Write an enzyme that holds these catalytic residues in place. Structure first.
Site, short mmCIF file in Angstrom:
data_model
loop_
_atom_site.label_atom_id
_atom_site.label_comp_id
_atom_site.label_asym_id
_atom_site.label_seq_id
_atom_site.Cartn_x
_atom_site.Cartn_y
_atom_site.Cartn_z
N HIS B 82 30.94 128.64 -24.86
CA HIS B 82 29.98 128.03 -23.95
C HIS B 82 30.62 127.84 -22.58
O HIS B 82 31.84 127.86 -22.43
CB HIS B 82 29.43 126.69 -24.48
CG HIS B 82 30.43 125.57 -24.56
ND1 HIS B 82 31.30 125.42 -25.62
CD2 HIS B 82 30.62 124.49 -23.76
CE1 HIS B 82 32.02 124.32 -25.45
NE2 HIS B 82 31.62 123.74 -24.33
N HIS B 84 31.21 125.54 -20.30
CA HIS B 84 31.81 124.34 -19.72
C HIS B 84 33.17 124.68 -19.11
O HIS B 84 33.82 125.66 -19.49
CB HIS B 84 31.96 123.25 -20.78
CG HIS B 84 30.70 122.47 -21.01
ND1 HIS B 84 30.49 121.74 -22.16
CD2 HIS B 84 29.61 122.30 -20.24
CE1 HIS B 84 29.30 121.15 -22.08
NE2 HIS B 84 28.75 121.48 -20.93
N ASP B 86 36.10 123.67 -19.47
CA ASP B 86 37.31 123.76 -20.28
C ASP B 86 37.35 124.99 -21.18
O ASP B 86 38.32 125.18 -21.91
CB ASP B 86 37.51 122.47 -21.11
CG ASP B 86 36.34 122.16 -22.03
OD1 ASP B 86 35.18 122.39 -21.64
OD2 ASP B 86 36.59 121.66 -23.17
N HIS B 87 36.34 125.87 -21.10
CA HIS B 87 36.39 127.13 -21.84
C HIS B 87 36.13 128.32 -20.92
O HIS B 87 36.69 129.40 -21.12
CB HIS B 87 35.38 127.08 -23.00
CG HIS B 87 35.51 125.84 -23.82
ND1 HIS B 87 36.54 125.65 -24.72
CD2 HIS B 87 34.79 124.69 -23.82
CE1 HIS B 87 36.43 124.45 -25.26
NE2 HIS B 87 35.37 123.85 -24.74
N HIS B 158 25.28 121.93 -28.09
CA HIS B 158 26.31 121.45 -27.19
C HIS B 158 26.05 121.93 -25.76
O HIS B 158 26.20 121.17 -24.80
CB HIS B 158 27.68 121.90 -27.68
CG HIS B 158 28.80 121.42 -26.82
ND1 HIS B 158 29.27 120.13 -26.86
CD2 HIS B 158 29.53 122.05 -25.86
CE1 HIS B 158 30.24 119.98 -25.98
NE2 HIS B 158 30.42 121.13 -25.36
N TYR B 189 26.01 112.33 -24.97
CA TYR B 189 24.68 112.85 -24.69
C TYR B 189 23.61 111.83 -25.08
O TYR B 189 23.74 111.13 -26.09
CB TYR B 189 24.42 114.13 -25.48
CG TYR B 189 25.23 115.36 -25.12
CD1 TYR B 189 26.24 115.32 -24.16
CD2 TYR B 189 24.95 116.58 -25.73
CE1 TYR B 189 26.97 116.47 -23.84
CE2 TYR B 189 25.67 117.73 -25.42
CZ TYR B 189 26.67 117.67 -24.47
OH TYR B 189 27.37 118.82 -24.16
N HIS B 223 37.86 123.98 -29.48
CA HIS B 223 38.84 122.91 -29.61
C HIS B 223 39.44 123.01 -31.00
O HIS B 223 38.72 122.80 -31.99
CB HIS B 223 38.19 121.55 -29.39
CG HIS B 223 37.68 121.35 -28.00
ND1 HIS B 223 38.47 120.88 -26.98
CD2 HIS B 223 36.47 121.60 -27.45
CE1 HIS B 223 37.77 120.85 -25.86
NE2 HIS B 223 36.55 121.27 -26.12
#
Ligand SMILES: [Zn+2]
Ligand SMILES: [Zn+2]
Ligand SMILES: [Zn+2]
Ligand SMILES: [Zn+2]
Ligand SMILES: [Zn+2]
Ligand SMILES: [Zn+2]
Ligand SMILES: [Zn+2]
Ligand SMILES: [Zn+2]
Lengths: 264, 264, 264, 264
Positions: B82, B84, B86-87, B158, B189, B223
């Protein structure tokens, strides 16, 4: 032997036949052609356009808006059923000439941004000027303009981003639930084992059920013949119009027959 | 009293702790950090990268590729779980420095194109350099590089565009079914009646069932702690790893508890 | 009376007449049609394509690359003269089928991204599938592939983003300075007081001087007849080719005559 | 030793210090902060915003518009000096919240679309939420809103797309020629032999001459201190303001000194 010349997207003449505005409800007007829907919704804070038709219809739409007392800068928002050339055709020009924003789901946004090119089924055969979506919409999200609330209902199949729009208007003050449901046709599509759309059949089947359950007193479709509207006969235009159930049922029967034929 | 200064996206140090390549299967290597997954798949016709981690990890990834004998121009394709920060953080820089293409579904493409800004839940709090997707992927579509076939499985929740990727590698010639499943967390969320994501709960619930049914001998997650991997212990990294069923079950129990809390 | 049908962009047959690769220098090959230039430069680290021709030429280009020993994944970079449909036509399809990147200046990038639509002079009359530029180039910037260095020289007029490309090849080991100079025509343009291009005349006049000063032993142009190449006669193709000075001089004389006519 | 954390773009407090609207001329108002210009021009057919400041200034700008009687939907157009985070910061949010369109030249459009990332000089150090330009502007092109005509004057250097805007307002009915000239600073830039901007010195030198010749009775700049405005002292704000000639002269002397230092 040279390579072939490019071919233009030609359509039936009735798709290109202008008509004067036809009132659907107190705030809602058909302002497209005899055979292509383009809905104008007039509110106290500006107008909303649902679909535009073919690329060459931009000037006609602006003329019909002017007949309704809507100036170019009064057009706030453009919503779409799906981003094929015969419904999203003039969107790029309308944005330049009105300052409107476009709202669409992610699938429709990306197809709109490439002008219908690299279509899952049509390739580059049916293209139009690209446009950018300004607001990305999620399934069930409500868009409000001048107090009128439009709810998006995703119904993938005809395109991945195909969307139905519902809102409540009045007819002389009495509420009427309008559903603008997208196409459920699969014109010449490979349905089974399509590498570009592996879950096409499952999406269509879910979409038939989505359309059946729409809140709806009056159904309209991007191609008016699909819900048995006849824009040419004026006041009697909606006499024979189908219900949501009948439209979905008819569409599913054609789909199942086409799928059986492809199997054979 | 002036307006507040902008705040940087700061993460736990272990997310930024480089590690040498760790072999997962014959063609598949973890080349990210101790706490962020970035998978390199090496084929006879080039390499595929699944995720990149944080924006500042671009140089580390290129160094680890070089240790594997993969030159910058050998990187053919970048796939994402996805979009975001951090990826997908370093994707823009990796494309500029390798000539790779990015493949993503429409939802991920549009979030990638705005650099994570206007996130449905985080707003503009966690942004990164924007990148453009070159190939749009549909649910169940197969992407092939050097004979290795990656299948996309959409698992929205997510993010709307969250995607699991499956492929079959070998372990000394014997086939092993790998599943790279996306996050199923909902960190802070609003789940119920969220105006920006009206069908969030339904999407998560479908996604739990999607993850349960993935073909999988070895599960990995963006993660690593989410599937009980421990990249720091080298050969024993996968000892305690969860199955797809256990990962989905654990995720759904946290989700249901969070939903009950929000209700109360 | 219905609205007019859309019209296709039709061109002279010789523009669509395939030809086998014609060697220009040790690393440089004409692989387009008899009347449209498309240059392949083969290096030790991959191939570069300068222009592609019309949209329907994508398959021909890939066939001619294969005759040269260039696989689809060996094509690293696509450079453009200008982003009209008859030179950038197949770029979108080539990117999808090769994994190549496109480098262009900002003006060319934005016109490429709308598929030639909303052209300053042609409107939506000559469109093609949109493509995205991956690397933005500045005037005088050097792009290197496999040791061969291409320098961009901006020459606005025919389009705002019109660009000349220069590089040094060899002819049996002896250096030869090649200049691929863009069109300097203004076909049916309003030159004076054009609201969409107020400084058109000044840009053309600067561009004539830019072309005159290019380092050049061998001039080529997107339309080969403009520099007196005859691709059909094989080995004698470049016999009558113009110098940079003669090409600029001829172009400026046509421009001045057209400007005097418009005045009158 | 882990990789470094990301760092936020922090600025002097006075850049973030809100101020009430300050009238510049009959239709023109400074509505930004004490140290960042954001000009509102109010016409009979809507408002125009020139620059927005930092990303976190979006709410302040909307508040100051409301004090002027400008509703969010009255904002028709956003124009920019240049697309760095401290002037284009809030543009994405303003478009979402007002329905305004953005007009910019091609260079500014492409930098805006990547949120200031991959800056020729700053890399990814100073980014902001990306936005899309809706109208592409050419040098000398006139943009009209409510009868007020804005003319763009390209002045590349500080960014490739740096633009000055001129228009004629009144001061109690008497005409006043306003020039909003962009920055001419080169803060920490490599000026000579910069591979990303080979013609930087030539562009700056042309831009000094462009600014000198602007039609101007009142000069304003994105950073008010650059033209000796003092927004904090209210009615006396413009007392010490520089002419166009003095601003260009001062900028060129700093530029020449910086270039001599870099040489040494
Ligand atoms: Zn359709
Ligand atoms: Zn249709
Ligand atoms: Zn995430
Ligand atoms: Zn994460
Ligand atoms: Zn041309
Ligand atoms: Zn041409
Ligand atoms: Zn700046
Ligand atoms: Zn600044």
């Amino acid at each position: 032997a040279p390579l072939p010349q490019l071919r233009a997207y030609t359509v039936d003449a009735s798709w290109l036949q202008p008509m004067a505005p036809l009132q659907v409800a107190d705030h809602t007007w058909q302002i497209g052609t005899e055979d292509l829907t383009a809905l104008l919704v007039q509110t106290a804070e500006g107008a909303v356009l649902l679909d535009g038709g073919m690329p060459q219809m931009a000037g006609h739409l602006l003329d019909n808006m002017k007949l309704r007392g809507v100036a170019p800068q009064d057009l706030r928002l453009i919503l779409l059923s799906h981003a094929h050339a015969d419904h999203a055709g003039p969107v790029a020009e309308l944005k330049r000439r009105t300052g409107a924003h476009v709202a669409a789901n992610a699938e429709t946004a990306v197809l709109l941004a490439r002008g219908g090119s690299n279509d899952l089924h049509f390739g580059d055969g049916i293209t139009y000027p690209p446009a950018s979506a300004d607001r990305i919409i999620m399934d069930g999200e409500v868009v409000t303009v001048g107090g009128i609330a439009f709810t998006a209902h995703f119904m993938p199949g005809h395109t991945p981003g195909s969307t139905a729009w519902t809102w409540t208007d009045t007819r002389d003050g009495k509420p009427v639930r309008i559903a603008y449901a997208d196409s459920l046709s699969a014109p010449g599509y490979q349905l089974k084992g399509n590498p570009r759309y592996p879950r096409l059949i499952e999406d269509y089947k879910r979409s038939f059920a989505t359309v059946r359950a729409l809140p709806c007193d009056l159904l309209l479709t991007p191609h008016p013949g699909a819900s048995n509207w006849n824009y040419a006969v004026g006041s009697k235009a909606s006499a024979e119009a189908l219900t949501c159930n009948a439209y979905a049922d008819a569409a599913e029967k054609k789909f199942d027959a086409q799928l059986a034929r492809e199997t054979a």
